[PDB]
Amino acid sequence: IVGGTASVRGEWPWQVTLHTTSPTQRHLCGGSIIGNQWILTAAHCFYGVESPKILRVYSGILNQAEIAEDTSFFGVQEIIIHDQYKMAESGYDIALLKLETTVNYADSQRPISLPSKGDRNVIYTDCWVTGWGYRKLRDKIQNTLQKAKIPLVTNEECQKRYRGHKITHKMICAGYREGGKDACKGDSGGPLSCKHNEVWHLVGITSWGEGCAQRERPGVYTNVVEYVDWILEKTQAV
Numbered sequence: 001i002v003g004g005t006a007s008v009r010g011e012w013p014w015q016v017t018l019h020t021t022s023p024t025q026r027h028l029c030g031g032s033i034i035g036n037q038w039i040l041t042a043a044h045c046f047y048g049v050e051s052p053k054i055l056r057v058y059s060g061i062l063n064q065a066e067i068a069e070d071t072s073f074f075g076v077q078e079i080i081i082h083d084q085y086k087m088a089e090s091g092y093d094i095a096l097l098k099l100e101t102t103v104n105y106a107d108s109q110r111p112i113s114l115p116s117k118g119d120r121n122v123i124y125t126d127c128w129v130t131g132w133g134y135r136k137l138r139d140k141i142q143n144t145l146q147k148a149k150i151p152l153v154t155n156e157e158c159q160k161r162y163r164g165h166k167i168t169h170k171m172i173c174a175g176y177r178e179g180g181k182d183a184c185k186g187d188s189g190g191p192l193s194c195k196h197n198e199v200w201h202l203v204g205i206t207s208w209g210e211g212c213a214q215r216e217r218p219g220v221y222t223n224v225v226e227y228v229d230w231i232l233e234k235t236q237a238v
């Protein structure tokens with residue numbers, strides 16, 4: 001996160017850090033708890049990932065320093081990537097992780113509500129992006145979970161800023177004209193969380209952008225409301 005501040009412990013209790021153990025253990029991506037056995041994250045996070053056996057999901061984390069060899073985690077049973085996904089910039093950048101065991105909810109870890117199809121008209125004015133990502137394009141993974149408040153941008157406004165791309169209705173954008181606050185490397189897969197009528201909704205998944213926090217270059221997020229049917233289909237048993 002560029003231009004953000006440290007989070008308070010447990011203030012983003014749906015936020016997880018997804019690690020890979022290969023070749024040695026490290027943070028891979030953000031993600032969001034959406035059900036007892038389910039993390040929602042970005043499809044591009046699994047480039048080259050051959051098996052779910054190398055993944056570990058940590059919930060209820062503020063600082064990466066909390067994670068040691070003796071720290072408990074959730075194993076991943078299955079990675080489900082959208083069958084139309086090819087790469088982040090062309091959309092469908094969405095994946096589900098089915099956990100091996102069930103998350104026991106608490107003040108430190110609980111699910112975020114998916115947006116309702118009826119809230120596509122809502123004008124969200126209290127949206128936050130969070131993660132352990134870089135503070136600048138060339139940087140490193142941060143210890144403490146960062147947060148930054150960022151306004152949504154219209155898809156017409158966003159399309160003018162990315163004339164070499166197709167900004168689709170299945171994407172949503174956020175950022176300041178002057179730049180300064182944005183997701184960056186290591187944040188992808190995490191939430192764009194918007195507070196509306198005292199309830200948080202998972203509006204976007206951190207997906208892509210040209211550089212980090214640049215002038216007239218909004219972050220681009222998977223527009224989660226466009227995938228509630230897919231999520232429902234994919235989270236069904238057998």
Ligand SMILES: O=C(N[C@@H](Cc1ccccc1)C(=O)NCCc1cc(Cl)ccc1-n1cnnn1)c1ccc2[nH]c(=O)cc(O)c2c1
Nearest residue numbers: 026027028045183184185186187188207208209211219220
């Ligand atoms: O590049 C990373 N993440 C990419 C995504 C990724 C994931 C897995 C493999 C390859 C790439 C990312 O977050 N990408 C973020 C994409 C992005 C989104 C938005 Cl909304 C706005 C701006 C950006 N940009 C960041 N940089 N340019 N644009 C990444 C992920 C985990 C890491 N762990 C480490 O220990 C050290 C790292 O350097 C590191 C880097």
